Ligand binder design. Structure first.
Ligand SMILES: Nc1ncnc2c1ncn2[C@@H]1O[C@H](COP(=O)(O)OP(=O)(O)O)[C@@H](O)[C@H]1O
Ligand SMILES: Nc1ncnc2c1ncn2[C@@H]1O[C@H](COP(=O)(O)OP(=O)(O)O)[C@@H](O)[C@H]1O
Ligand SMILES: [Mg+2]
Ligand SMILES: [Mg+2]
Lengths: 346, 350
């Protein structure tokens, strides 16, 4: 007697059939566990597609979690991130070839193509093309920083409200969405955690996890400290208050702000130099300004200096050494930095 | 008073200056922690260049370990892997732009370009193009498997002899080196460990390190099993004998053999299907043949069947469930699979 075969179960999104998707050859890029491609959905919709790397441990499971968090965000925080269009799962026989424009075997996630340009690419081209992409009328460091940070902090606040910590906030993961007025949208929930039981936490555990070293405080690569209890439906709220995992995003947002506000900090080496000096003076912005800024003769800190040093103060709040002292993204949003100009004389 | 500052320090290899390197846009590939590009050195030497990914934690440290291991291999096991040409470190102001064909800020590693096609690429195009690339006169599955495995196992034996476990053995990390008679060379020591204190172990720790699941036994994604002693100068030799981290490479080599030997196993899905069945029958090759091979009417196991099933037996040796039973790469080399046939080549022999 031989064991019988049986059907394969495949995950599918209503309205999305494999026949509807053409994949464009050539990866947009690759992350720790997956690869991203451009595609065309139903003949005339520009989309982006992600699959799991065949050569990476647990890649499918990592992509499944990214899927779960994408559904959560789609339901609870629309507009914060690239629009999620669901998934498509293919078997081996029915898998095609990327270079021939067809989806290969495995799980694929699909989003709208929100734009060809990331904030990292734009800022490095310059403040002008960045402002243009963002539809930002004040095409200065201060202007783009105000608009971008209001949008970023607003979106992070909404994500945190529904229990999601993004965990990979940085210019490379922001797109100025031209079809939506240039507003910034986050991408890449590949490292995101769901930190409340809805119905269960996801990708949320004690100890260090994936982090971009440029945008994570070097001694804080965790959402929950290594000593923390494992999260459960019963202790999740307590852990959120105790360990403030959302403050991981706050620090990253501060890094974004520094790069938007100061042209010389837009290279990796530039921001790295700043953060090393910032740590050296005890994560004290005023100490940096007094002891270190004189060393930065090739840079212009005017955007941070403006209006009683409002920008510096906001960076300080977002980048306090201690999480318990560090501003939430919601609180940061109410900062003087974002105040409307008084008496504009129209 | 003001702090005085001072010069930057940059790592360099004598005879290799960044002005002499042109980088070609378009990553050749990207792994877990780095990105590889084609380059041209001194206007006419085809090279390959690797830097760290800026977005990956400690990619910097991983690239440094890859560098160290490459220096070790260059000194102790020449010809086993792509020829290592050294490092080039660039600073901020002297750093360039990939689009301008210049090396960017940070540490770079450089190797000779050993060939445009990997064994993975070749085998999937067919045994014929693979055999041609390997200069393999016997252009059959058996022929290419014999020649490739002799070369691979020989090189793994040399690497293990100098304390190095490659940890990423697979067809994608083998190149048939056109300029050295088609002989296979390993690439990508990015996951490699130096497992002996020479003078210090490198990238060697208990627990599931990086592993390509296709080429790693599902429950053996480690070199050293967790909890077991952290590697130190005086427990190193002990751990080598006890946990046999080199047998990680043995299993991978078995996977390579399966794909070389059986065309149907050259796809990810094909090899995956086989290993699942192999696991299902208790990692017993004869049981697979007896209970399962009837389900593989799509495929041809002739290369493994040949000569009293010598190929099957070598696979069994390289792929024992238990490391304590699994052949070393050195031991595998003397297997009957590699024997010359009686009177082989008699018709032209002098
Ligand atoms: N929804 C989207 N719309 C437009 N572009 C996207 C979207 N999602 C991802 N991308 C792009 O896909 C790419 C992913 O590549 P990335 O992770 O940066 O690879 P690497 O780390 O090798 O640079 C990024 O350039 C990103 O801008
Ligand atoms: N020394 C070398 N000579 C020629 N090609 C090389 C060398 N080192 C690396 N490469 C090529 O660089 C590429 C790295 O790509 P990667 O994504 O790391 O692996 P994969 O082939 O699994 O995608 C490989 O295609 C490999 O053939
Ligand atoms: Mg003012
Ligand atoms: Mg760098």
């Amino acid at each position: 007697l031989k064991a019988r075969g049986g059907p394969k179960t495949l995950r599918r999104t209503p309205g999305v059939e494999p026949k509807d998707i053409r994949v464009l050859p050539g990866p947009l890029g690759s992350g720790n566990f997956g690869t991203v491609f451009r595609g065309v959905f139903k003949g005339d919709q520009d989309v982006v597609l992600k699959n799991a790397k065949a050569d990476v441990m647990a890649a499918e499971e990592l992509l499944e979690c990214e899927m779960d968090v994408n559904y959560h965000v789609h339901a609870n925080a629309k507009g914060t991130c690239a629009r999620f269009m669901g998934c498509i799962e293919l078997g081996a026989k029915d898998g095609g070839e990327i270079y021939n424009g067809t989806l290969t075997e495995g799980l694929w996630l699909m989003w709208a193509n929100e734009g060809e340009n990331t904030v990292e690419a734009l800022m490095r081209r310059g403040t002008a093309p960045l402002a243009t992409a963002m539809a930002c009328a004040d095409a200065t460091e201060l202007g783009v920083t105000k608009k971008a940070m209001r949008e970023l902090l607003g979106s992070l606040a909404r994500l945190h409200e529904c229990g999601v910590v993004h965990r990979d906030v940085k210019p490379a993961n922001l797109i100025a969405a031209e079809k939506d007025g240039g507003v910034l949208k986050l991408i890449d929930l590949g490292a995101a955690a769901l930190c409340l039981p809805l119905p269960e936490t996801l990708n949320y555990y004690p100890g260090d996890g994936p982090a971009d070293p440029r945008y994570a405080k070097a001694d804080e690569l965790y959402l929950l400290p290594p000593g923390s209890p494992r999260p459960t439906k019963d202790n999740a709220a307590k852990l959120w208050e105790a360990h403030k995992p959302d403050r991981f995003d706050s620090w990253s947002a501060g890094c974004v702000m520094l790069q938007l506000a100061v042209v010389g900090l837009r290279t990796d080496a530039g921001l790295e130099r700043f953060l090393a000096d910032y740590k050296a003076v005890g994560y004290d912005v005023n100490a940096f300004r007094g002891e270190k800024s004189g060393e930065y003769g090739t840079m212009d800190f005017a955007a941070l200096d403006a209006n009683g040093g409002a920008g510096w103060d906001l960076c300080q709040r977002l980048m306090e050494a201690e999480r318990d002292a560090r501003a939430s993204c919601e609180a940061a949003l109410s900062h003087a930095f974002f105040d409307a100009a008084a008496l504009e004389h129209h």
